[PDB]
Amino acid sequence: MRALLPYLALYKRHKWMLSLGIVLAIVTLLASIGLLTLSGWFLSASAVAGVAGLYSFNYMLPAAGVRGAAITRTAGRYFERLVSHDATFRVLQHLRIYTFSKLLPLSPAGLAQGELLNRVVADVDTLDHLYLRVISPLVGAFVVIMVVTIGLSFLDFTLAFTLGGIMLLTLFLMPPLFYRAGKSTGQNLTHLRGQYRQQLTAWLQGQAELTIFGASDRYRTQLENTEIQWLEAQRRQSELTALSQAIMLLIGALAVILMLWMASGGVGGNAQPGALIALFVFCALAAFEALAPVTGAFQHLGQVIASAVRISDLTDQKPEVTFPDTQTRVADRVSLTLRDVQFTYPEQSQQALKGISLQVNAGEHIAILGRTGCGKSTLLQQLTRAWDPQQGEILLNDSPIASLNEAALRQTISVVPQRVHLFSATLRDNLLLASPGSSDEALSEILRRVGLEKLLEDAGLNSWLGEGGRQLSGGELRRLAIARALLHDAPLVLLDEPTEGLDATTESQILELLAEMMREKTVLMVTHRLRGLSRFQQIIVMDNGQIIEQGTHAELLARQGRYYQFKQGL
Template sequence: MITPDRTRSLPLQALAWALPLVRERGATLAAVVILSCLGSAAALLPPYLTQRLVDDGIVGGKVELVLQLCAVFLVLMVGGVLIETLSRLSYLKLSAHLLFGLREQVWRHLQTLAPTYYARTRGGEILSRLDGDVAEVQRFALDAPMAVLNGVFSLAVALVLMLSLSPLLTALVFALVPLQVAALILSRPWLERSTHAMRKESAAMSSFFVESLRAMKFIQASNAARRQEAGLRAHHGDYFAALRRSQLASLGAGGLQRVLSGLGVLLVFAVGGALAAAGDLSVGVVVAFIAYTTRAAGPLQTLAGVFMGWQRAKVSLERIRELAAERPTVQSPAQPVPLAHPVRGELRLDAVRFGYGTEAVLEGATLDIPSGTKLALVGASGAGKSTLIDLLQRHYDPQAGRLLLDGVRLDLVDLAELRRQLVVVDQEPVLMPGSIRDNLRFVAPDADETALMRALDLAGLGKLAHAGGLDRPVGAMAATLSRGERLRLALARAILQDPAVLILDETTSGLDLPVAQAIIGAVDRVFAGRTRILITHNLASVGAVDRIVELRDGRLVEPDPVRSAAPLLRVV
């Protein structure tokens, strides 16, 4: 689980978050470090050998030495290619492990958050943090230490070799380093602001796509396609403006670094060339030094890139830290109280109070539901019926009062066990992408073919399954199934879960009365003797019930027949 730690600096947080995952691949990390250092060393030797090739071999007229050094060059080139290949493959393995592990931690955290978080947060914003921001932190957490290590090692080796050739030219080249550091510091605020703006616009565009795709049928029916295109163009314009600012910031900072590096090369040309012309320095040394100046610019550019990468990672880490600060509303108890088996399904609400913010939805709600009861729960829209179901499944805990299953407080029961025993079928059930088999095994991964077919038969989908097979795809957003088929498939999933309590939350709302009665008939046959709670606006669709309870003004009461008969019997 990711946890925000404001006592640490952001760089330390990024590294601390990734460290446990890196430790799991310690051998791979060691291989990457060793191969990286070997590759850097192999790349730094040619300029030094070039000096001997020019001065001792070519100028000195030693053909044998020239051939020997050419052979060494060939070995270094082939060895460098092999080392780079092994290094990149090892790094890919380590990088993928780290990225996937960090993303899984964020996903694990997201799965603990309450429905209210998803109600107030745009889907594209969550996707942006889960994908782009996690990847940015991963790159910094792994790439930055590796880049710093490789850059410092390369600079140290280059410095030793350059000093051995010419201390004066070495001093000229490294005299520009303070200017490069100052340029990076001055560019930092610009980089940070532009990166934050680009992340924000990227998240807004992702949200536009997610929400528009979900509402595509409505957009088509409303003749709003052109307006949506105009909205997309507006998002593109905002994103391009933010992207341009970010690119200008990166190009400005990087360009200044390249100019300063180029200035170092020009100084070597000017001073080294003058010394060589005066006979105070060999041509080979000047040639080698020009090569080293160019190559020394690489590690310096890498270190500058780490700095600019940190500005991007800092924004991403702040965004992930905001997500991590969202705390779960409920957690499974450390030492859960086991339910007696078989679970009877007896429910009790004892003076339950719950509200969102200052608005109370339930106020002293009290109700006893004996095991095996078929109860119809009615009430006006917005009265809190769905909130009550969320409390029973422990998406929230009551702010006062108690909810009990078989005499055990719900907050003392293992969360997974509670949700296995108390299953909800919504009026718009969520079906996952894939086939009918995939959707059934989503809730019962170990169920065999016989159990799957039995569940479909009991739910009234036997003909559909036999005709198309369990491999029939449900389509995007279950578009290949009718609403009645989607409800029956959700009922088949509930049958496989085999709960002690089944809740139908407006499941038959909007269906033709015969279809609704057929679905309720299947429920009564399969779940006879178990606790059933049917939330409805149409009592005619739920058949005979043992009890009717109305949720009114935050309380559970017996309905007044005169006051409520009309709305309760209305087909909606």
């Protein structure tokens, strides 16, 4: 319950909208109770008065009651639905912005995955349920009971506290008792659901293997056995909800029976209550509608609390990179220099690898050539400041990289990643990402000059990409990454394995695209492919995280070192 505190704090924005929804929920319930109680009293009072009491009996004042209660009940219900749904969409928007704003500063390393993010989206959806599914019914039930108890004690304190006491006692005791009674079943239920999903994913992914080896029929048999156990846990959970719905009817029965019995003896000082008996029994009949959502509301608090812990576990991680507030001016020419920084992870070498310490002058293209299958390259991550370098120092234009504020750092470095992401938006939005303000024609000429003509053939810039449609192939998807880096127009360009997974035709076109477009920019290109390296001013070949040798493609072959062996087809 302490876990919900940060999400409860999010309710300060739109506090009036959220509280109006609960107030309208209370007013609708009180109008339902007041309308039935007034009708029950009116029948008794008029029946007792009889025909002889027509002239003495006042009915104008009850007439305003049944008119007022009927209007405030139908208008209360309509606006309770409208206001509480509108408020539920407001809190979802603020939950999504809050979660995204927390996840952004800890983006690369904090999140470590596609199953995690589907679970993060579903958890945010569950925190959105806390208001209508949990808070609105529980708070609305409490105030209705208190208003009924207080208002009904002007007649008799003993009767009001008996009906109000029974309703308060079931409001506070029964939901925790049923939440506790089904906690054992709700754990076997989560275990059996995750076990079924694991056996289903293994049965679907290994369908080729299972069918070939003749095991596809007996691995579906244990899948159906898990489903049977899973459905037996769901049946046990339904029998608990069956009990709580039956017990709710008996508690409502007890209140009516007690009011029929106790109020018959006397209401207030009047030992002959008459019409006042029907006032109490009809209040008891109507009052238990307020408690209908309550046990189901407290059950859902268990799901909401689980999601709140799970989201807080993710968004409360410490960001491992901090950015100053200095308003540095981005230079038009970037000269990157490195000192004692590692190119790749330790890779279980346990040799305490020394730094690389290379130097990149402004305007020069340098390719870092590293063995395939070795430790994964990490120079891209610590140049975009995914994490700080634990050893050595990275200077960007003879100034430390940590001295750049985020706005300047992202504007002085444009990177084409190995994993290029297609956002679901239109083709124009997938390119306006790189440069936010760009002319529609300056945007289209980029698509022409990178060789993406097919993307302007019919739907053009408005064509929907991503999951909506128009999946891009690996070759043309690489030209999308380069188009963004060209639009970004940063002085330093970082290419990570750009020609990987490409045919010789596409690989040659993209390499030529790099040279002519990125002539005036420093590129630090990291590949394990020998193609097109004659254009680079400097080639750095390294084995086991150490520069074995370095030089231009001409003089590097003359030394007949490790690079010459690669050119031999070794």
